[PDB]
Amino acid sequence: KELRVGVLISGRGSNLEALAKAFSTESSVVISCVISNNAEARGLLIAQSYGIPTFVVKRKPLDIEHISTVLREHDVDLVCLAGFMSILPEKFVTDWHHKIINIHPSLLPSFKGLNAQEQAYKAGVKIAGCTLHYVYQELDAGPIIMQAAVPVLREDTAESLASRILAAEHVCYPKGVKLIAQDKIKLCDDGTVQCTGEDELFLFQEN
Template sequence: MPQDLPPTKATVLISGEGSNLQALIDAAPLMPHLTIVRVISNKAGANGLNRAKAVSIPTAYHNLISGKYYAVGEKDPAVKAAAREKYDADLAKKVLADEPDILTIAEHYVISEVDRGDPIVIRKIQCQTPETLDELKTRIHSQEHELILEGTQLAISDLWKKRSKSEELS
């Protein structure tokens, strides 16, 4: 992985185990330019928060229900849509407060619609028979951990190329 990139701050969004976050943490020696400035989860009990705290990365919890964006059991689609819009706007404020250079939630570029950005990296995983569900999950996680590193590195490289071009045009 290239070592000559400028310092790059990342905010990481998680919702569960945080194994992709752990892959980034473990890759720190290979990506010394990357600093994870905060991990934000929509689940208070997400193990990824523990992973972040274990290496002194600040964490935050941001949730639709506990944040009182709408009540448990809300059925009105208009209320839920408005609440989601406010929730997303508040999440964006939290992220922007970190002044990150990149945001990682999945391996695609982030746009206003959650999980809808252009893919950064894609990898096909061949089905194998016979294979148990646990074996498949293990293979998927292994590929995911490689992809998170590859995608993060590509996003950082792309970011600094674009910033460099923009400075040249100014």
């Protein structure tokens, strides 16, 4: 109980799971709540198996006052988007500036937006990966914290490449949050992000 995290989900919560496994030892970080905009989100069950309180909110229109209410009430320092499917409103992004992050299944700034893996596959790139980044006003364009690269093999499908990238997301997200919790992440004057400790912000994952 030092860095308190809130995780926003809409789906299976595989990244949430990685995050909950990583920080339930010895650990500096606490996931204080998980919030979903989908009552059918399987990630809610993962959350409940780790003893983490869960909350379902209305989707359309998104009940953002309830989200903020839950986050304030659980003393959240850092909001992690992990498969959350909505466009967040301006005030909320403004309000949590420097305190919301996301993981996106491409090597940004390439392949912003939905369907990032399919886009890469059709593109014929030979290397792909994931990016952890602060959530700013423009979708998928805030400053980059960590990146991890994976290869695309001759025999891949769009779906098999996704699994390889998702595998890499599982390693990158928790490492990233850990660096934030132990005070080693720093936004610089030029708007780029840098680590003040020994650790590196790049990962090369081979498969």
